[PDB]
Design a protein around this ligand. Structure first.
Ligand code: NI
Ligand code: NI
Ligand code: NI
Ligand code: NI
Ligand code: NI
Ligand code: NI
Ligand code: NI
Ligand code: NI
Ligand code: NI
Ligand code: NI
Lengths: 133, 138, 138, 133
């Protein structure tokens, strides 16, 4: 079968905006758009990195009042006291926080941590940045 | 609050690969991952419409004992007090420092800052991460 | 710029002890040390006149897996978005975290924040450091 | 001799303010005031601490455009990459910066670093905070 069809649920608001945009862009339907987002994702998450020694920053944005992301983030970070040096936190508003986490370790292990972070429920957005000093 | 449920048709091999990956990474479900994609998509767009508060983080690596970079950076940064919130600094070794600046303001402005910083002769590495301020996400 | 030179008479044994100490510490001269004292003196006073922008840093240590502290702290902090600039966090070990909040605003306000934070059942240690914003120093 | 008399130079502005204050307070002359400041200083810098293991924060405020404090601070911090974990820097205005430095080490060695910092010319003010986790 060339196409697998499925459903996903999204908050009305977040959907309204996504729709307004893919409309400006000229997409005919949501499937084309999401398809591309997935394509681009699959690519960026295949640029496999070895086991070098790197220094990075994991920037994240989340709602501290949502689910239990606040603790999941702390518990998860304390698991790696060796790769995680420090973290800068800026309170964006009543609910949202922006956190930058500085790390150093095996480029492969660092990427694993960043992903375990960005994937937690409650983390709205974020990006990893690695660099060999 | 109101949840809308909609269906989409994705290329089976593309989807199979997607699912395969989100598992490796650690996403619990595909929905979450797709919402993140959409959220990210909306956030990138948020930056394309030059006017509207956004947040970002300029990460840079440099040798402080080289050129004038140390000062050059501060002057530049102090030239943008309203956009820069605060920066974190880690001393990598005897010569190299890793710094991560946190910015908030108009997208265009922030891009100009990152440009001025990253183009500094003394900055060996550096990336600007365009993220959000949360105010309009979910 | 205008430098004023003035003379003072200090108890010889007190001075001898002062000099002895600033050497241990590392001050190059007594003048510098005395200027710092005066600067500090002016800064403390700056806090006693409840109205005028000042800066400070609330340092706290706690166990995140204890009580509700982790959340309690954020709520408190998010209740003061205009005074709190950003905080730095270091994971001491498997259970304890060290956090240093940076604040800027009216002295009274800042003292109230430090009070609300430090009195939190879960905060084991913590000090508020009243410093300056530089705007009126030299 | 019970009293040693000496001169010190201060920027007119900084002196104007110091004077206005010691006047409100009721000091008869600048020597009484400075005397006390020195007394209080000598006390706080005698509470000798052993060689325990502590975690601290050194908060400093300085004019990055003054002398060469910016480099003196960096060079001096890179000497101790073991006790100095990270540092948060906030640009206060055109010239002034506020920096918080997080440290961990032998309470005795930490106090030595903090003092070498606060004493550098260009550092307008600051305080150390140690605590045994
Ligand atoms: Ni935990
Ligand atoms: Ni927050
Ligand atoms: Ni997520
Ligand atoms: Ni400057
Ligand atoms: Ni450094
Ligand atoms: Ni809350
Ligand atoms: Ni922690
Ligand atoms: Ni150096
Ligand atoms: Ni600065
Ligand atoms: Ni000084």
């Amino acid at each position: 079968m060339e196409l697998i069809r499925f459903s996903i649920s999204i908050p009305s608001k977040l959907l309204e905006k996504f729709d307004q945009i893919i409309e400006e862009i000229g997409y005919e339907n949501r499937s084309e758009a999401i398809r591309d987002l997935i394509r681009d994702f699959i690519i960026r998450h295949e640029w496999e990195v070895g086991n070098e020694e790197v220094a990075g920053t994991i920037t994240i944005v989340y709602n501290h009042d949502e689910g239990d992301v606040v603790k999941a983030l702390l518990d998860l970070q304390h698991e790696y006291l060796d790769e995680i040096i420090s973290s800068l936190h800026v309170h964006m508003d009543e609910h949202n926080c922006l956190e930058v986490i500085v790390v150093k370790g095996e480029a492969k292990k660092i990427k694993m941590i960043a992903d375990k972070l960005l994937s937690l429920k409650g983390v709205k957005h974020g990006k990893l940045v690695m660099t060999s000093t």
